[PDB]
DNA sequence: AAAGATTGAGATCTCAATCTTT
DNA sequence: AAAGATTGAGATCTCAATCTTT
């Protein structure tokens, strides 16, 4: 039997709040200004960044840190509104590509500045360089920790 | 209305991943070992901590940083499985109390150690004291920033 | 009216089952 | 068989509408 010290509780509690408030603030900013939730927007960003604006489903899920299932549903929804389309992998008749359409790229161009502001104002404008450095070192460890290479691990995109 | 440096962009990414992986890891740990998602478990923890193991709805929402709507739905679900019950406020026939049942308390006693481990292994076991200090200072600013007292704001529990 | 809280519908996420291809 | 990916059902969250009490 362990437990958390009161000091640790304060750290953890303030993490939980912050995260829950950020996701809320950003989801809302994106739902009004761009018509989609934060996770979806992130998918478009990752494709926009990819070679030929495309990425195979599992690779997309891996970057997003979500499950293939969630990704499929999300891309059905994004395909419906025309921001994304799908193609077959030619060498492997099993794979599928998610490709960002022109119109999808135009929604990023239209909305990103808004979304960037919101992410600035909530976070980066409030932290000294030292803490920005410190935040990234910290989250990278937490992330690294939760996606080890070790064999039979429970990674979302391998679910 | 400036741009984000590439460094800042990378910090932000690694934040998003970490958070998305933690919520995933903890939701799953709590869904198997305790039969409920992380946010719900939090509600039980806050009541367990409260005087008389009870708290009025809006107060509960304010601690949890969620909306009243989400809270009502969540407490219907917790009431159904018997971990929570409701009472009327006697002075104000408008208010409602959320009270943690005995059996609900027994689910915390049973599961907390598991949940604490999972939160240790993912986070605290991986950070030096300096970074634990640093994390809390950082998130507390982000949180404080997103819930100002200054009236014309969009706080979940006031939605 | 506004405050406290709930409701139902539709959107999304999770889980398990399924299909095809390797 | 396992890998890549999708489906549908049920669980949960959001949004707007609603009800009761102040």
Residue numbers in the entry:
A (entry chain B), B (entry chain A): 5 to 163
How is this structure described in the published paper?
MarR family transcriptional regulators (MFRs) are widespread across bacteria and archaea, where they regulate various functions, including the response to oxidative stress (1–3), pathogenesis and antibiotic resistance, and are thus of significant clinical interest. MFRs are one-component response regulators, having input and output domains fused in a single protein chain. They function as homodimers and regulate gene expression by binding to pseudopalindromic DNA sequences through winged-helix DNA-binding motifs. Most MFRs are repressors, and their abilities to bind DNA are abrogated by the binding of small molecule ligands or by sensing reactive oxygen species via reactive cysteine residues. Using this approach, we identified two potential operator sites upstream of sco3205, which encodes a putative MFR, one of 42 in the Streptomyces coelicolor genome.
